[PDB]
Structure 1
Amino acid sequence: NKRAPYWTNTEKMEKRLHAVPAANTVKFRCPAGGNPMPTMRWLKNGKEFKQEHRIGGYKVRNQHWSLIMESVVPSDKGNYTCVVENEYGSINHTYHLDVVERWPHRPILQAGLPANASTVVGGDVEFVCKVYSDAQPHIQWIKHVPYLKVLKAAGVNTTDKEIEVLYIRNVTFEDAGEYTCLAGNSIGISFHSAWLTVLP
């Protein structure tokens, strides 16, 4: 019973977009059947996929109609198409690969921020704080009064959208002192302090 190529397990093919954390192995499969035994080719962005198209190349296990790429990186992003065929037909399926780099570190703040500030009573002043983190960071501003006072803390009511900058209008001699921006995530905590000096 000679027949054109067909997918023998469409279940394993439903997931078209494969987004994985960098450094992981990706295995694309296109289980096929058909008599005679159809052949298989893989394309990267519609063009032939050669071993030199990526460091380390890739591996193919014909027995399982799969394409294997180890330790993927961002540049591997793109479309991968499997082309199966025999004398009675030719069918293809395309997968999209997307690589995401994780950054497993406690929050990191920009050196120098917040910066020291000076002003005469009644004046306005601000402290900026630039944070970078993969895991969602929690930022809060604290004044030293170790006697600490939370002046502002991120949350549903105090979005990150404006938590990075701290304003203090009509500052008073009371306001003087050490301000700190503290950022923390599941991995750890980090903070940078600045000093506000109020003059007569």
Structure 2
Amino acid sequence: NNKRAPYWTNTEKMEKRLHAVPAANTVKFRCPAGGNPMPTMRWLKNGKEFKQEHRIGGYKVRNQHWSLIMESVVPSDKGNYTCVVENEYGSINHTYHLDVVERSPHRPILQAGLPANASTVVGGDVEFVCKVYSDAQPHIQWIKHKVLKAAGVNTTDKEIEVLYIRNVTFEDAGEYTCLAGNSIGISFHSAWLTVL
């Protein structure tokens, strides 16, 4: 009749038990539950009551969507998160294991889509850009195909980012490369300046 012990309304969303993500990211655990009376939901971090004050920045809950959300995850968040749906006729639970991963120290990273190919008529001023993200000031150098500019003492970081080429020529046409690196590794992306 109208007696119904808690049941999973969407097993799919629950497929993924192990949640491994880069630090800083925001994780969300879901446990879609059905049951009449409507069940109630509560979360458990490593077996115990996951109280708001258990982590910096607490956590938001979405009753409507039977979920738990943690923003800017840190290594201290590592653990098992268990949902417990229950009403007078029974209870059900699921447990997610969270593994936050600090990817730093890591090689430089170049904002995809930069350097951006270019092309201009002789006489004008072409431009090239390379944005790099690294744990430490990245060693970056432009390589025209000889080494054009190169971040050091006479060239600062904000300067190295953009490579200008005033009043071009049909000689400047070619493959410009942005190579960047650090103690862990290096990456590099090219760009083509077509002369018209």
Give the CA deviation at 1:53: 0.7
Q: Deviations over 1:94-125 (max 9, x none)?
A: 00001011237547999999999999999999
**Is the alpha carbon distance of 1:63 and 1:173 closer, same or farther for their aligned partners in structure 2, counting shifts above 3 Å?**
closer
Contact 1:142–1:151 (8 Å) recurs in 2: yes
Paired with 2:15 and 2:118, the residues of 1 have a C-alpha distance of: 58
**Is the alpha carbon distance of 1:116 and 1:93 closer, same or farther for their aligned partners in structure 2, counting shifts above 3 Å?**
closer
**Is the alpha carbon distance of 1:29 and 1:116 closer, same or farther for their aligned partners in structure 2, counting shifts above 3 Å?**
closer
Give the CA deviation at 1:19: 0.4
1:63 match: secondary structure: coil
Q: Sequence identity, in percent?
A: 99
User: Is 1:73 matched up with 2:70?
Assistant: no
1:5 match: secondary structure: strand
Paired with 2:107 and 2:127, the residues of 1 have a C-alpha distance of: 25
Give the CA deviation at 1:177: 34
Paired with 1:111 and 1:68, the residues of 2 have a C-alpha distance of: 29
Q: Provide the TM-score with structure 2 as the length reference.
A: 0.56
Runs of 4+ in structure 1 displaced over 2 angstroms?
Answer: 102-144, 149-199
**Is the alpha carbon distance of 1:25 and 1:167 closer, same or farther for their aligned partners in structure 2, counting shifts above 3 Å?**
closer
Deviates more, 1:2-11 or 1:152-161: 152-161
**Is the alpha carbon distance of 1:11 and 1:173 closer, same or farther for their aligned partners in structure 2, counting shifts above 3 Å?**
closer
Contact 1:102–1:134 (8 Å) recurs in 2: no
How many pairs are equivalent? Answer: 195
Q: Deviations over 1:110-149 (max 9, x none)?
A: 99999999999999999999999999999999999xxxx9
Give the CA deviation at 1:52: 1.1
Q: Deviations over 1:137-174 (max 9, x none)?
A: 99999999xxxx99999999999999999999999999
Give the CA deviation at 1:17: 0.4
After superposition, residues 1-200 of structure 1 pair within 5 angstroms as 1-103=2-104, 106=107, 189=186
Q: Deviations over 1:46-92 (max 9, x none)?
A: 10001111001001010000001000000100000000001111111
Q: Provide the TM-score with structure 1 as the length reference.
A: 0.55
**Is the alpha carbon distance of 1:43 and 1:159 closer, same or farther for their aligned partners in structure 2, counting shifts above 3 Å?**
farther
- Contiguous gaps of at least 5 residues in structure 1: none
Contact 1:107–1:183 (8 Å) recurs in 2: yes
What's the Cα RMSD here? Answer: 13.5
Contact 1:107–1:131 (8 Å) recurs in 2: yes
Deviates more, 1:17-26 or 1:134-143: 134-143
Give the CA deviation at 1:187: 9.9
Deviates more, 1:130-139 or 1:75-84: 130-139
Paired with 1:193 and 1:33, the residues of 2 have a C-alpha distance of: 54
Paired with 2:11 and 2:180, the residues of 1 have a C-alpha distance of: 46
1:141 match: secondary structure: strand
Give the CA deviation at 1:2: 2.3
**Is the alpha carbon distance of 1:53 and 1:181 closer, same or farther for their aligned partners in structure 2, counting shifts above 3 Å?**
same
**Is the alpha carbon distance of 1:67 and 1:194 closer, same or farther for their aligned partners in structure 2, counting shifts above 3 Å?**
closer
